[model samples]
Target: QTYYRNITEALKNPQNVRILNLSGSKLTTLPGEIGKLQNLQLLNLDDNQLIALPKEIGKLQNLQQLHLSKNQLMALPEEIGQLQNLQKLKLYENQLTAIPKEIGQLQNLQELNLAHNQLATLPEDIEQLQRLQTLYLGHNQFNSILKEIGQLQNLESLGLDHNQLNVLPKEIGQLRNLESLGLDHNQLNVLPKEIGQLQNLQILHLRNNQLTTLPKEIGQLQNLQKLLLNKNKLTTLPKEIGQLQNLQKLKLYENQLTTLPKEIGQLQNLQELDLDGNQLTTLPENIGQLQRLQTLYLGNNQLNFLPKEIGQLRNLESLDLEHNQLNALPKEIGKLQKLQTLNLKYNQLATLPEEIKQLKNLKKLYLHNNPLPSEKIARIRKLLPQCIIYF
Candidate 1:
């Protein structure tokens, strides 16, 4: 409902203002008489220290949503493609080193945020927009992309994160209506087996990349649900990654995994499973077949033992076996019973599972640098008196 924020009182009724909010106004200059507001439609100059923009804002041609973000705009006046009813164009953290290939003439652009700029390249005339659907060039210095960006084809979310891409653009598997794909901190060691043609991907941010392997056709996506491979250098995986099965959050932490593919308990709508600092010593007792698992991050691995099928997770709620070398547990770890946050810090427990006094929805129990026995920490502080035990 912000219809105006002083463009000299909205040019004193420049034919009835149509929303113009001067955001974080420290605007250093923009008044090309605001292009006489020709029925402006949403023009918010966000966080302004604006260094440039007035190619008379292309006379506003009924502009539709154009918020110049954190501005120190370095360049862009190819009359900004004369607006032509622009559709959401946010130039994020701009010191824009380049872009104006007439912005592919907008063509009703549908969301285009050029993120933290110093862009390394773009404009193969941007394949003429064709109703672009969200395109963020993340923290740019892009090492590459433009296969005319797979001709957009109604793209749906694509952010090239902290770019210096090592390779890609097998016409990015022609989008096929991509659904979220931010190649995280790129220096990718490899990918494009046409990224298994996306197939409507549902989040796939390859975190801190230098991936050591994958493309077993990535089990053809199957509507993936978040799979951010943490600090990759993966030593293995592609058991068609257990055919995704509508995966739900599976972040392989600091990889160099020593073993897993007991087909990762066939996903089954997995609910968070981060194998931290891998080099696992053993697991695949079918890892207790997941069954709607809930938050289980085997922290800093190299476990001395576990797979008493690991107390069959009955929907475990956070259980990061911190720095392992576990001396004993599997008294079926008192069957989880919806356990609540239990990190067994630096394991090699001298005593713990007197069936962990049956969890009873335990809350936060780290057992610092284990080797308990101040008389078993006073009988586990009287058997979990409302948990929060750190040592």
Candidate 2:
């Protein structure tokens, strides 16, 4: 261990240095001597008080990774563009107001993080980072997206959540290679039809937005596995959603949906479906088509009854129907032999069907706030001696 606490001593053997870590040192400025480390390939200066980088830093032509995250940096020297070999740059959690256009000169950069900053817009030259595959720009002040954004054809994952973007550019459709796109907690009122062009997308997050509907083009995402649409104002989903045959998890809680399209039953691969806090009164009979479903949440709805076909989900393990208007459940409920947890609280059920005793695998049952007679409750407790019953 060299144990060099200051830059003066650290530079004594600069030619032999390839990695230097000075993170959490409370540094307010970097010594110009940093430029002397000609062979340095990795530098860590995170969690410091640095307000700026010395222009001399651009001299490190061999640097491949630079960590300046969790600092007070408000600006970067344009000379940073001189690092032609840099592959990764971490500048998150900083106070940066803008980036120099010279940043586009880093032709080899693969990953760049600029989250938790005050940037409202990006320079057009940003499109020059053609090799960048991962970019994190969440928690910024961006109010609009630039058409130049479509230039990042190689991007596989992009994060624009927690920003002020109200609309997306049609040019966004050019990113056919993107697999994950996050736009949660934004001001977006609608999505561009071009969004459907991302055929490779597998995960899409759009929670906490003002969207009332989605473009029919969304169905084009045949590879999507997870779709999060919670906390939106959507009243209905386009029938095209049925095209996502590969979808496994779908979240639509906290919406105003009155009913789902019959095509919803086409999602045979769905395992988890969340429809809590909606206005749904009943489900389509074909709901039973989801034979692979394991978890179903229908709490806080206006549902008066469930489709008897629901029992077709022989693989179901958990079911929640709390805070609904259900007065009776299908006799088919007993068909879920794999069910381990059942929540039917806050309903008006007077008695449960005797078929429930068939749930031999049942371990927990919650029927609280119901009006079942004490005698019926006693009979249920006797029927499942090994299960915990809450009445």
Candidate 3:
């Protein structure tokens, strides 16, 4: 049987209700009426006006999940450790400046989200949550991640974005099962080489961070699929990067890269490449070997020409050539039958190949800033009537 509001006064039988939700009731505190329900298995009092919880909450022997987010809670009852069966606990978006020392007692805990709170430092006892898998500690004022983070052996995903972290503990390498890690929007200047130990990692987002160079060991992440390093100070990539044979997406926009390793073409599975806002004078000829590539971004560079081998990427779907030094485009580029979006704005190009009309699948085309012959520009529309040409 399910009921709303605190029925602690009505339920004379202690074992009648198993789960209870009294959230958003504007309740200032949990009445002792709760201890009467010895059979309670779960309790949800989130978004409430409560400033504290009764120590009697520890009496719930069967409780597994406790939701106490969005409240004025500043501390927890020390008796909370008595809930030996508890698995999940959410107390984020609260006034908590620190966690209760008893939280480590939740040995069966699998996921913990403590984002958007006033936590300045995590309790070292957090290591006691051995079964924890996901931890969200973003949007906090934590200046340092306890070296104990490496204790989360089963953690698959960790979100520490939007925090005040400057460096990661090498202990992070202990989390070999971690598949996804979010460390974007921080003050990190370098990543620990231990990061390469996460062989199972598939997505690594470090955008908008202050990274100047990636660890040479980064190539050890052979299973990584998407690597976001945009908006950083990286002037070059380690040649070891070619070892990532499983990589599919690489974002290097808004950096100082003057050239890419010729080995990048070895990524047989690469599908998208973003290299805008760089200072490249030329692209490696090996770039043409990414036969599986579908999208290419080369905007805001200093390149005046592309290798004819570019035509080898027959699967390319979109190509952004805006804001570059392209004086001419290879007619072979027209061979991209699947090409869709092409941005060629703000360039010094004097003409485009008539073969561009051969792009049967081209859709959105921007050609502003290039001084092309009006007659040829007019012919462009007639040749690819399926495309929306912008001047």
Candidate 4:
């Protein structure tokens, strides 16, 4: 690495220098001569003691990547928009409270990382970045957003976690190409029906929110595969949830749900279902129709018994019923010859049936918080040595 106080010394051979790193050299500013390097494409000045940048820094028209992280920059040079060819900008771990509206002129930019900053709001002109595909603005104080954000038609991933947002703008539905949306750890109480317009959505994470109900239009996402709504106030699910036939994972842990609809059986491709931390007293017998189900998390519910039809889930691999009120399980559970993991922890279970020994393929068996004695546990263990019994 060449250490130089004046980057211009190398400008005579600028054609030979395509990348430059002048970071952390105790320099508080850049020399205006930096704009003369017409061939420079990448610039790194992160972790430096710089407090501000000169507007002339935007003269690097060929610059495709810029790193200005870990500095004392409170704002960016409005001339930065002059770098129309810039595609990547990293400005995390800074004191930036806001950005210049001119930054919206970066039409070719694809990734922008503004995490771990004090930004409480964003420039409304951010919609000018028409080619942006990824945006990271998490861990900030942003309480609301401007409607123009929905104009980013090419955005695929949006991270807005750990913020004070209580409502999402309806314009969010305009991002039709969105594939992954991370809105966890926010105060969102309700979602706009316009969210159903995200036809390409594959993963929707709304965990750790205050949501009480989902918009029925959620069923419009025919390509959605994973839906996480855990840690919410949902007492019921939108009947349209059954329309997600392509859904493979559903996490609804920690809610006030009492019953599941027969329509749940329509998710023929579902392989995992998490219903832990609910008030359910019974599961829909139609749950047996999930021919592809491999994992079922039903812990912390009020179920007292399992429906005999559960035996029809011959392909089930993992079944968690911990912290429930079940007194006995149907002997038909033995029909799951492919079962490998079984959890009955923290329940009113008095005794396990001898049929439990029929799970020759079982690998993990959790029986904590039950009334079974050591002798009974040992008897089952002796009968199924292939299973790891946790009493």
Clashing pairs in 4: none
Candidate 2 lDDT over residue span 46-77, tens digit each? 99999999999999999999999999998989
Worst 10 residues of 4 by lDDT: 1-10
Lowest lDDT sum, 10 consecutive residues, model 1, at 1-10
Candidate 1 TM-score versus the reference = 0.34
How good is model 2 by TM-score? 0.97
Q: Show pairs that collide, candidate 3.
A: none
TM-score of every prediction relative to native: 0.34, 0.97, 0.94, 0.92
lDDT of 4 by residue, 137-246 (tens): 87788888678889999999888888889999999999999999888888999999998999999999899999999999998888899999999999988879889989
lDDT tens per residue, model 1, 66-108: 9999989999899999898999999999899889799998899
How many steric clashes between backbone atoms does each model show? 1, 0, 0, 0
Q: What digit string (tens of lDDT, one per residue) describes model 3 on residues 1-391? A: 6443566533655577777888888878788768777777778888888888888888887888888888888877888888888887888887778887788987888878888887888888988888888898888887879988888888898989888888999999888899999988888998999999998999998989888898989999978999999899998889889899999999999999988888888889999999989898888888889989998999898888898888889889989888898889888988888888988898877888878989989999999889888888888899999999997
Query: Could you tell me which 10 consecutive residues in candidate 2 have the lowest summed lDDT?
Result: 1-10
Task: Output the lDDT of residue 44, model 1.
Answer: 90
Highest lDDT, which number? 2
368 in model 4: Cα distance from truth in Å?
2.8
> Per-residue lDDT for 11 in model 4?
67
Off by over 4 Å in 2: 1-6
